[PDB]
Symmetry: C2
Subunit: 153 residues, 2 copies
């Protein structure tokens, strides 16, 4: 098995810890943890290409997308590797994240270790918003908090 972890922080109140676990090569990756400080409702949740937080979340680059495909929803064939399910914050601003994704990986060509996890202002429109930015980013608005994805024990 491989494990990874990410501490999300930013300039507002959003903060969280997200865990990743993959039992075997090419297997499903479990992604779970809690993010607080969010507005009630859906928030885009992405793996961005670069683990570069020198300019805060801005320096993380675009969605992780090694084959230069269009933005999609997590269940789509045509998606970026970094296109994870929106997270849902409750009335108290807390998202209890629980995702299983078999497109991301903790090894190989879809490895996300050393890349940046970002939680967004608004819901990701799953690439179905009907405009060019929908097909690139999902129109999830600003990058509220982020962190680099690290190897965990």
């Amino acid at each position: 098995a491989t494990k990874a972890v990410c501490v999300l922080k930013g300039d507002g109140p959003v903060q969280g810890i997200i865990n990743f676990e993959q039992k075997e090569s090419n297997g499903p990756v479990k992604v779970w943890g809690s993010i607080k400080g969010l507005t009630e409702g859906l928030h885009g949740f992405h793996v961005h290409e670069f683990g570069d937080n020198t300019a805060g979340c801005t320096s993380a680059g675009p969605h992780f997308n090694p084959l230069s495909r269009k933005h999609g929803g997590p269940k789509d064939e045509e998606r970026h590797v970094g296109d994870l399910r929106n997270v849902t914050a409750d009335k108290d601003g807390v998202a209890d994240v629980s995702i299983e994704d078999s497109v991301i990986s903790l090894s190989g060509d879809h490895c996300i270790i050393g890349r940046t996890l970002v939680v967004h202002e608004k819901a990701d429109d799953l690439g179905k918003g009907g405009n060019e930015e929908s097909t690139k980013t999902g129109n999830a608005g600003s990058r509220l908090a982020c962190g680099v994805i690290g190897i965990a024990q």
Copy 2:
């Protein structure tokens, strides 16, 4: 070439940005950047095993050491993979870091991407301090600042 970057943070005083570049596979890695907030003189500088900042720098684990070797200086055959040269801070508390290291790597068995870079309170004693902790950690004191090493553009 592969590139990586690390933003070093702690609890306020010590902050820095460190760049990594490896022009070829199995080639030397250039390590350079600036750390501020330090006391003048030598400070330990290590790659620790885990990219886990959930408990600040304390959760980074031991020195990166895949073959379970003893701690050493960077020019020693017997060293940890993570045993980088001490950095030197000037009279204004700034270390202008400039290292070339052929033991760390940005791919393969010695890959440091997704691990934690740490700058320390005191000088690393190069494993020559004559005690068991010398042979384990170099007796560099507290972890002043750290960050996860991320893939850079």
